[PDB]
Amino acid sequence: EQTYFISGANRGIGFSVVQRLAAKSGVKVIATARDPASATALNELAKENPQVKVVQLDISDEESIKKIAKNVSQYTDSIDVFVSNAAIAKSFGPLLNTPREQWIEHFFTNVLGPIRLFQELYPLIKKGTQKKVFFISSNAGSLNLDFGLDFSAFGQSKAALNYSTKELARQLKPENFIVAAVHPGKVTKITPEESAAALCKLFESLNTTGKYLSYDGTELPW
């Protein structure tokens, strides 16, 4: 029935999302890892559960992104639900203390990567039924939330991706796409499995485009 694509599936929320989706009948899961050979838990899941297909992706690497569509296509003729989950969070604290390379790495990995990944997998998503597009954002990316914390290149990258996500939702509303930015929670802290359970109910239930959502389905201000 349905194909999910989850970037960054070897650990954290991505692994827990793939584990949760692997439990549902009639769900095929394209799961990505930078280094699949070292994705122990994900490889063992895929060994027990043939519905889970493991593909290499480095979203920091144009040469990897240029291959994701042809490689995914070996395993599926369509994607129902796209989840750009793979990301970095390596730069917090004041602007004056954040060197050039942190800004660059968060832009390439957290902004350009997800945009190029979507661009490449759009034809596969257009061919699917559900046409859902989820960007795993952060409440730190809001322009209208104050946490009393600096988020530096990490927060900027989530705001940047948020801006483009909102635009994308407008652009693909006439093609009946559902596009969302989703804050997965602080992983008060929640566990990745709890986040994944809530994220997967959201992925299945969300029926409107253009939303910025917390994992529980409540709205966040852009």
Ligand X SMILES: NC(=O)C1=CN([C@@H]2O[C@H](COP(=O)(O)OP(=O)(O)OC[C@H]3O[C@@H](n4cnc5c(N)ncnc54)[C@H](OP(=O)(O)O)[C@@H]3O)[C@@H](O)[C@H]2O)C=CC1
* Binding-site ranges for its own copies (CB under 8 A): 62, 94-96, 98, 100, 103-104, 107, 111-112, 115-116, 118-119, 122, 141-144, 150-152, 155-157, 159-160, 162-164, 166-168, 170-171, 221-222
Q: Determine if residue 137 is labeled as part of a ligand binding site.
A: yes
In this structure, the chain runs to a length of 222
* β partners of residue 6: 31, 83
- How far apart CA 138 and CA 75 sit, in angstroms, is 30
- Cβ-based nearer residue to its own copies, 37 or 96: 96
- How far apart CA 20 and CA 71 sit, in angstroms, is 23
- Cβ-based nearer residue to ligand X, 126 or 186: 186
- Cβ-based nearer residue to its own copies, 53 or 116: 116
95 interface partner picked from ligand X, its own copies, none, CB below 5 to 8 A per type:
its own copies
- Cβ-based nearer residue to its own copies, 72 or 115: 115
Q: How do beta strands 81-84 and 132-136 pair?
A: parallel
Binding site for ligand X (CB under 6 A): 8, 10-14, 34-35, 57-60, 85-89, 109, 136, 138, 140, 183-184, 186-187, 192
CB 221 within 8 A of CB 42: no
- Return the exposure string of 30-63: e unless at least 16 CB atoms fall within 10 Å of the residue's CB, then b: bbbbbebeebeebbebbeeeebbbbbbbbbbbee
Q: Determine if residue 6 is labeled as part of a ligand binding site.
A: no
Q: Determine if residue 116 is labeled as part of a ligand binding site.
A: no
3-state secondary structure 79-145: CCEEEECCCCCCCCCCHHHCCHHHHHHHHHHHHHHHHHHHHHHHHHHHCCCCCEEEEECCHHHCCCC
127 interface partner picked from its own copies, ligand X, none, CB below 5 to 8 A per type:
none
- Cβ-based nearer residue to ligand X, 1 or 101: 101
Question: Minimum distance from CB of 100 to ligand X (Å)?
Answer: 15
Question: Minimum distance from CB of 211 to its own copies (Å)?
Answer: 13
Angle between the 12-22 and 40-48 helix axes, to the nearest 10 degrees? 10
Q: Determine if residue 187 is labeled as part of a ligand binding site.
A: yes
Binding residue positions:
8, 10-11, 13-14, 34, 58-60, 85, 87, 136-137, 158, 187
